[PDB]
Amino acid sequence: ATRAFSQIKDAMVFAFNLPAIVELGTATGFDFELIDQAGLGHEKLTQARN
Amino acid sequence: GAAWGGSYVNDFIDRGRVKKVYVMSEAKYRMLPDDIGDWYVRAADGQMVP
């Protein structure tokens, strides 16, 4: 299915099966939240993100 | 009130954080009751009243 929808579209369409326990860690990974602690606006934070 | 007690009226945006907006009489116009006189209310006719 992703075979079908990757190579043939103008939009990205991905297919997968659900994990066993319906809400958990991808084991070999993380979930990083980059934070603005001093007084800055959206521009500077997104810039830091990039 | 809004002269001598004050008025939280509305909210603004300081360096990224929502904070309050107050409008109150200045320093010198509310220490002694003489200052009671100095304050004027405007009638339906357009003319102030002490």
PDB file of C-alpha atoms in Angstrom:
ATOM      1  CA  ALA A   1       0.000   0.000   0.000  1.00  0.00           C
ATOM      2  CA  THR A   2       2.775   2.512   0.763  1.00  0.00           C
ATOM      3  CA  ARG A   3       4.394   0.973  -2.290  1.00  0.00           C
ATOM      4  CA  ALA A   4       1.385   2.164  -4.214  1.00  0.00           C
ATOM      5  CA  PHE A   5       0.991   5.625  -2.655  1.00  0.00           C
ATOM      6  CA  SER A   6       4.617   6.823  -2.434  1.00  0.00           C
ATOM      7  CA  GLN A   7       5.809   6.844  -6.003  1.00  0.00           C
ATOM      8  CA  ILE A   8       2.470   7.808  -7.519  1.00  0.00           C
ATOM      9  CA  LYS A   9       1.268  11.059  -5.796  1.00  0.00           C
ATOM     10  CA  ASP A  10       1.364  14.843  -5.243  1.00  0.00           C
ATOM     11  CA  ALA A  11       0.645  14.261  -1.540  1.00  0.00           C
ATOM     12  CA  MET A  12       2.240  11.898   0.999  1.00  0.00           C
ATOM     13  CA  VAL A  13       0.008   9.018   1.945  1.00  0.00           C
ATOM     14  CA  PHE A  14       1.370   6.347   4.322  1.00  0.00           C
ATOM     15  CA  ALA A  15      -0.053   2.988   5.426  1.00  0.00           C
ATOM     16  CA  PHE A  16       0.742   1.070   8.628  1.00  0.00           C
ATOM     17  CA  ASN A  17      -0.624  -1.434  11.192  1.00  0.00           C
ATOM     18  CA  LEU A  18      -1.365  -0.443  14.761  1.00  0.00           C
ATOM     19  CA  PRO A  19       1.149  -1.232  17.559  1.00  0.00           C
ATOM     20  CA  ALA A  20       0.241  -3.893  20.123  1.00  0.00           C
ATOM     21  CA  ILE A  21      -0.362  -1.778  23.214  1.00  0.00           C
ATOM     22  CA  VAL A  22      -2.328   1.157  21.775  1.00  0.00           C
ATOM     23  CA  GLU A  23      -0.238   4.132  23.102  1.00  0.00           C
ATOM     24  CA  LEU A  24       3.455   3.372  23.733  1.00  0.00           C
ATOM     25  CA  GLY A  25       7.142   4.034  23.038  1.00  0.00           C
ATOM     26  CA  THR A  26       8.731   3.305  19.669  1.00  0.00           C
ATOM     27  CA  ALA A  27      11.375   1.443  21.741  1.00  0.00           C
ATOM     28  CA  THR A  28      14.507   2.539  19.801  1.00  0.00           C
ATOM     29  CA  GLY A  29      13.573   6.244  20.199  1.00  0.00           C
ATOM     30  CA  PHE A  30      12.502   9.503  21.791  1.00  0.00           C
ATOM     31  CA  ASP A  31      10.181  12.515  21.924  1.00  0.00           C
ATOM     32  CA  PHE A  32      12.154  15.785  22.231  1.00  0.00           C
ATOM     33  CA  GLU A  33      10.446  19.020  23.194  1.00  0.00           C
ATOM     34  CA  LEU A  34      12.464  22.162  22.507  1.00  0.00           C
ATOM     35  CA  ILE A  35      11.544  24.932  24.883  1.00  0.00           C
ATOM     36  CA  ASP A  36      11.658  28.713  25.068  1.00  0.00           C
ATOM     37  CA  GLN A  37      12.440  29.746  28.683  1.00  0.00           C
ATOM     38  CA  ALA A  38      13.465  33.408  28.149  1.00  0.00           C
ATOM     39  CA  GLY A  39      11.232  36.096  26.635  1.00  0.00           C
ATOM     40  CA  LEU A  40      11.158  35.221  22.894  1.00  0.00           C
ATOM     41  CA  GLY A  41       8.472  34.918  20.179  1.00  0.00           C
ATOM     42  CA  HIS A  42       7.596  32.097  17.746  1.00  0.00           C
ATOM     43  CA  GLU A  43      10.170  33.224  15.123  1.00  0.00           C
ATOM     44  CA  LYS A  44      13.252  32.626  17.264  1.00  0.00           C
ATOM     45  CA  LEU A  45      12.067  29.293  18.675  1.00  0.00           C
ATOM     46  CA  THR A  46      11.193  27.806  15.240  1.00  0.00           C
ATOM     47  CA  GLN A  47      14.569  29.088  14.041  1.00  0.00           C
ATOM     48  CA  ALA A  48      16.275  27.193  16.868  1.00  0.00           C
ATOM     49  CA  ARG A  49      14.228  24.162  15.845  1.00  0.00           C
ATOM     50  CA  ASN A  50      15.487  24.257  12.301  1.00  0.00           C
TER      51      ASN A  50
ATOM     52  CA  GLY B   1     -13.275  53.118  41.608  1.00  0.00           C
ATOM     53  CA  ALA B   2     -11.106  52.907  38.466  1.00  0.00           C
ATOM     54  CA  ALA B   3      -9.318  56.024  39.728  1.00  0.00           C
ATOM     55  CA  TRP B   4      -8.808  55.046  43.371  1.00  0.00           C
ATOM     56  CA  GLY B   5      -9.281  51.237  43.533  1.00  0.00           C
ATOM     57  CA  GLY B   6      -8.298  50.532  39.957  1.00  0.00           C
ATOM     58  CA  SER B   7      -9.525  48.522  37.014  1.00  0.00           C
ATOM     59  CA  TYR B   8      -8.336  45.287  35.613  1.00  0.00           C
ATOM     60  CA  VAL B   9      -9.861  45.870  32.258  1.00  0.00           C
ATOM     61  CA  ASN B  10      -8.283  43.678  29.648  1.00  0.00           C
ATOM     62  CA  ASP B  11      -5.223  41.458  28.829  1.00  0.00           C
ATOM     63  CA  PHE B  12      -2.081  41.968  26.711  1.00  0.00           C
ATOM     64  CA  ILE B  13       0.999  40.088  25.440  1.00  0.00           C
ATOM     65  CA  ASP B  14       4.371  40.751  27.154  1.00  0.00           C
ATOM     66  CA  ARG B  15       7.472  39.152  25.476  1.00  0.00           C
ATOM     67  CA  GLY B  16       5.418  35.986  24.997  1.00  0.00           C
ATOM     68  CA  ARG B  17       3.286  35.923  28.178  1.00  0.00           C
ATOM     69  CA  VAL B  18      -0.269  37.088  28.663  1.00  0.00           C
ATOM     70  CA  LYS B  19      -0.450  39.650  31.490  1.00  0.00           C
ATOM     71  CA  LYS B  20      -2.937  42.124  32.942  1.00  0.00           C
ATOM     72  CA  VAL B  21      -3.909  45.725  32.009  1.00  0.00           C
ATOM     73  CA  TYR B  22      -4.830  48.171  34.786  1.00  0.00           C
ATOM     74  CA  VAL B  23      -6.020  51.784  34.574  1.00  0.00           C
ATOM     75  CA  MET B  24      -5.815  53.776  37.796  1.00  0.00           C
ATOM     76  CA  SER B  25      -5.457  57.375  38.967  1.00  0.00           C
ATOM     77  CA  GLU B  26      -1.878  58.662  39.036  1.00  0.00           C
ATOM     78  CA  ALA B  27       0.285  59.006  42.130  1.00  0.00           C
ATOM     79  CA  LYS B  28      -0.610  62.602  43.103  1.00  0.00           C
ATOM     80  CA  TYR B  29      -4.388  62.656  42.732  1.00  0.00           C
ATOM     81  CA  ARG B  30      -5.330  60.270  45.575  1.00  0.00           C
ATOM     82  CA  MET B  31      -3.430  60.790  48.859  1.00  0.00           C
ATOM     83  CA  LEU B  32      -5.513  63.447  50.589  1.00  0.00           C
ATOM     84  CA  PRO B  33      -9.289  64.185  50.201  1.00  0.00           C
ATOM     85  CA  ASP B  34      -8.512  67.473  48.371  1.00  0.00           C
ATOM     86  CA  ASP B  35      -8.009  65.069  45.493  1.00  0.00           C
ATOM     87  CA  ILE B  36     -11.656  64.015  45.922  1.00  0.00           C
ATOM     88  CA  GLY B  37     -12.578  67.340  44.388  1.00  0.00           C
ATOM     89  CA  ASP B  38     -10.254  67.041  41.408  1.00  0.00           C
ATOM     90  CA  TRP B  39     -12.327  64.327  39.749  1.00  0.00           C
ATOM     91  CA  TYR B  40     -15.018  65.017  37.212  1.00  0.00           C
ATOM     92  CA  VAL B  41     -17.977  63.065  35.848  1.00  0.00           C
ATOM     93  CA  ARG B  42     -19.504  63.973  32.459  1.00  0.00           C
ATOM     94  CA  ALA B  43     -23.311  64.286  32.127  1.00  0.00           C
ATOM     95  CA  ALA B  44     -25.670  63.580  29.216  1.00  0.00           C
ATOM     96  CA  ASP B  45     -25.309  67.228  28.153  1.00  0.00           C
ATOM     97  CA  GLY B  46     -21.536  67.086  27.615  1.00  0.00           C
ATOM     98  CA  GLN B  47     -20.579  69.236  30.619  1.00  0.00           C
ATOM     99  CA  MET B  48     -18.362  67.852  33.405  1.00  0.00           C
ATOM    100  CA  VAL B  49     -19.478  67.868  37.072  1.00  0.00           C
ATOM    101  CA  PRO B  50     -16.993  67.928  40.006  1.00  0.00           C
TER     102      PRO B  50
END
